[PDB]
Amino acid sequence: MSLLERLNQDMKLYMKNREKDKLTVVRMVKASLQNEAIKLKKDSLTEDEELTVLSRELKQRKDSLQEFSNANRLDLVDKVQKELDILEVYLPEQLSEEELRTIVNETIAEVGASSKADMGKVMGAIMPKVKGKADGSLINKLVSSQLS
Predict the structure, then answer these.
(1) Euclidean distance between CA atoms 14 and 36, whole angstroms
(2) 18 — alpha (psi -120 to 50), left (phi > 0) or beta?
(3) Sign of dihedral through CA atoms 98, 74, 83, 34?
(4) Is the dihedral of CA 30, 34, 39, 42 positive or negative?
(5) Which domain-ending residue is among 91, 106, 140?
(6) How far apart are CA 57 and CA 61, in angstroms?
(7) Which residues contact 32 (CB under 8 A, 6 or more apart)?
(8) 56 is in which domain, residue-wise?
(9) CA–CA distance, 54 with 40 (Å, rounded to integer)
(10) Distance CA 36, CA 57 (A)
C-alpha cells in the first residue's frame, strides 16, 4: 500500500472513530504530498521525494511548537505536540541531532572526505542512512560544517 493509499485509509478510520486531531494532520500531509506533485507537474512523487515532504511537514511543526512556546501559548504548544505525535507514525524513527552528527562524522570518515570539494561524495553516501530520519536542511548543514 502506497503512502497516499495509507493516508486515505486512515482518513476514513479517523472519521469513523472520531479522531479529529489525527484526521486533520493526515489530510494536511496528504495535501502537501499532492501539492508537491502538482508543483512538479507529475502524477505522483518518487518515494524519496515523499520522504522529503514528510520531513518538511515535521520540521514546520517542530518550528511552530518552539515559536508558540516563545509566545507562551501553551494550548497551541500542546496542539502542535499532538500533531508531531501523530505525524511521527508515518516516518522512520527520527535521529536526535547528536545521533545525526555521529553519522555525519562516520560517513565523512569512511569515504575519505575532508573538504567541501568532497560534499557530493559525502551526501551520496549519507542519504541512504538518514533520509526521512532528519530534516534535509540540517543534514546538508552538518555535513558542510564538518568539511573544510
Answers:
(1) 24
(2) left
(3) negative
(4) positive
(5) 91
(6) 6
(7) 53, 56, 57
(8) 1-91
(9) 16
(10) 12
The amino acid at 140: N
Measured between alpha carbons, how far is 7 from 26 in angstroms, rounded to an integer? 6
> How many residues comprise the chain?
148
CA distance 101 to 108: 11
Identify how the structure was determined: X-ray
User: Are residue 2 and residue 48 in the same domain, yes or no?
Assistant: yes
For every residue of 4-61, DSSP letters joined together read HHHHHHHHHHHHHTT-HHHHHHHHHHHHHHHHHHHHTTSS---HHHHHHHHHHHHHHH
Which set of grid coordinates corresponds to residue 99?
545521533
As given in the structure block, the three cell numbers for residue 43 are 502524477
What residue spans of 40-96 are helical by DSSP H?
A: 47-70, 74-87
For residues 138 and 70, membership in a common domain is answered with no
